[PDB]
Amino acid sequence: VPRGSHMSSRTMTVDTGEELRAFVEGLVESGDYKTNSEVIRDGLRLLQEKTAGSKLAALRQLIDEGEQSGEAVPWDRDSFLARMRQKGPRGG
Amino acid sequence: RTMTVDTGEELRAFVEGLVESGDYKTNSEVIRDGLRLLQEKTAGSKLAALRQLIDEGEQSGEAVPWDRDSFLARMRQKGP
Amino acid sequence: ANTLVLKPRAEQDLERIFEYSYTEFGWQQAQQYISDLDQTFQTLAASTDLAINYDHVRPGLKAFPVGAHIVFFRATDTGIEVIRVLHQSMDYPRH
């Protein structure tokens, strides 16, 4: 990274549960995949593929669920952020 | 027991959208759905898959005597 | 003042967006992101010409981008009504 700049790599820490964890481990140890990350990405590609053809239906459903969620009410930024602070200690 | 993974930007954003929509509770739930699909894809062909791994072992060269001391020395030498 | 109202589900979207940002980036960035969404909401409530026509999803639906998100809303007599705020990965743009 050039000086005065920072890494912008972005990971996530996930709990796969024991059954799927062992599944991932076996795939890496067999040499079929190089890392846990490669296995997880293959899974996410399949999940993205499964729903790729129905994005319009999916968005309609999210919009409809918004429409059906109750009458609209006023928005206040400061009240929202107060409510967020009230949920627990906040830092950074 | 968790794992820290790099999904790359495209799939990371894919995961974020699914959590923020409320469709899934956490990043973990999204990842588990993906892994279920991957497990499902191969679930019906475990015998062929094992045969392929065994064959790849058989075809990997002449067997050599197991030398535990050499192995552990090599492991130490990598990134001491 | 032009009207600005939000469906309950849109508020819950904002909470999830805030929490997601907070986990990743901490308070200052997450609150700023919400503030930027707020600034966008105010602009859209004032200017009908900014709204992107999203009839192809639902008649009368409008969209507008902010950051990595899209505000989905309807025009009212006096302003806008926000229905959902979704990550841009959920978009279905007009073909």
Add this chain to the structure above:
Amino acid sequence: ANTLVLKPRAEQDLERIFEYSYTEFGWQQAQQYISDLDQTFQTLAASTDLAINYDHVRPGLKAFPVGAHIVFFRATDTGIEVIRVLHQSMDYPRH
């Protein structure tokens, strides 16, 4: 002394198993795990009766568990020849 030889890919399996354990748990646990595998290899080289018949995968193939892994091997005149060491999630037990 019974003989014990490994295919090159089985030795590479052991490296991957070592690295996986090392990343998660550190040196001591990874070395212990390899020690357990080594102790099992020695036991299998000594006692033909321990080997599980895995003809249903390949004729003459044998399996034996250690920890969360399976040693796949063949009997030789003087001991064993290890073909792969795989996580038990890769197993296909006899129908």
